[PDB]
C-alpha cells in the first residue's frame, strides 16, 4: 500500500522550496493560483502574494492545510490555489551531501570538497554566506543548461536550507595556475597545447550557448587527474542572445590584466572580450604561470595597453602560439578570432608537434 | 588581481 502524499512530512513535499530566495519564487510562479511553500521558522505560502502560516492555519500539518485549501478551493485576500509548483530536478537536500574541507574561496564565500552520500561521488560545493546574495544562484542557472567535457558540470543545488550551496563536479588536480607553477617544469609543450585546446573547446561551447564568461584566467581553470582542463567559476558569467552584455551601472570588480579595453572602460563584454582573456591565458600557460605585466600596476597596464603595449613572447613559446595570442589582443573586438578559429588553430598546432 | 571600478 501507499502512504498518501498529504501524510508525508513538509520536508518531503515537492512544492516546499525551503530556502528559495525571492527572485526564484518570482521566476517559478507562472499562472494564477500557482503556489509553493517556503521557509521565511515561519513557513510562507506564496500563491505573487506571500501568506505567513499545535495546528496550522491562515490542521495537524502544513500539507494537511494545503490539501484542504486545494480540495475545497476556499480562499486564503481573495486568493485561491490552483497548482502546486514543484522543485526542479536539480534541487538536492542538504543530507544527500557530506561536506568536507575548504578548497577555496570567493565573493560569496567558501568552496568545499564534499561527497554525495548515496554513491560516494566527490564534489565541489560553493557556499553562500543581501543584493549580491540574490546573484549567487546565477552560476547554477547558467550551468544547468550545459554539459561539455571542458566545462565544470553542475550536479545540484541545495536551496532547501541555509546555507545555500551549489554542487559541482570535483576536478581533483586543482586550479591551472597552481598546476603550471608547481608541475609546469616537467610538462611537455604538447601537453600544454592540449590543455589550452581543452580551454578553447570549452569557450567555443560557451559562445555557441550565448554565454560570456567574463573571468577567464588560469586561476579559474581546473585540471583533472589526467590533465584535462575544465573551465570553472561562472559567477560573473552572462547569457546574451544578442551577444553583448552591457555592464548595468554601479561598482564592478574587474580582473584588470585579463580584461579587454572595451569591457574595462565601456563595459562592453562579449565572446570577443573573452577572447582577449584567452590570449592572456595562453600567455600564462606558455610562461608556466608567470604573472602578466609583472612590473606594472593595474592602472599602468590599462595605459600601456591603450598605447599599443602588449605582453612579450614567453621564452620558447612556439611562434604560432604567440601569433595567436597577438591576434587575441587586437584592439578592436571585431578583429579578434572566434573561439572556433582559435580551437582549430590550436589543434592544428598540436597535431604538428 | 581584482579592482573595484
Ligand atoms: Cl543516501
Ligand atoms: Cl586600475
Residue numbers in the entry:
A (entry chain A): 446 to 485, 489 to 495, 501 to 506, 511 to 515, 520 to 537, 541 to 593, 598 to 821
B (entry chain B): 1 to 5
What does the paper say about this structure?
We have solved the structure of the prototypic SH2-kinase unit of the human Fes tyrosine kinase, which appears specialized for positive signaling. We investigated the structure of a polypeptide from human Fes comprising a linker region N terminal to the SH2 domain, the SH2 domain, and the C-terminal kinase domain. The three structures were determined in complex with the ATP mimetic kinase inhibitor staurosporine and were refined to low R factors and acceptable geometry. The SH2 domain, the kinase domain, and substrate apparently interact cooperatively to yield a functional Fes kinase complex.
To better understand Fes regulation, we also solved structures of unphosphorylated Fes in the absence of phosphomimetic salt ions and Fes in which the regulatory activation segment residue (Y713) had been autophosphorylated in vitro. In both cases, a substrate peptide (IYESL) was cocrystallized. As expected, in phosphorylated Fes, the phosphorylated Y713 formed a network of salt bridges and hydrogen bonds of the sort typically observed in activation segments of activated kinases. This links the conserved catalytic loop arginine (R682) with the activation segment and additionally stabilizes the active conformation through hydrogen bonds to R706 and S716. Second, binding of the substrate peptide also induces a β sheet secondary structure between the substrate peptide and a strand in the activation segment (βI), with typical main chain hydrogen bond interactions. Selectivity for hydrophobic interactions in substrate positions −1 and +3 can be explained by binding of the corresponding substrate residues isoleucine and leucine to hydrophobic pockets on the Fes kinase, and selectivity for acidic residues in position +1 is due to formation of a hydrogen bond with N766 located in helix αG. The binding mode of staurosporine to the ATP pocket is similar to structures reported previously (Bertrand et al., 2003); in addition, two molecules of staurosporine were identified in crystal contacts in Fes-substrate complexes. A striking feature of both structures was the large degree of disorder in SH2 domain loop regions as well as in the loop connecting the sheet β3 with αC. In addition, helix αC showed very high temperature factors, indicating a high degree of mobility of this regulatory element.
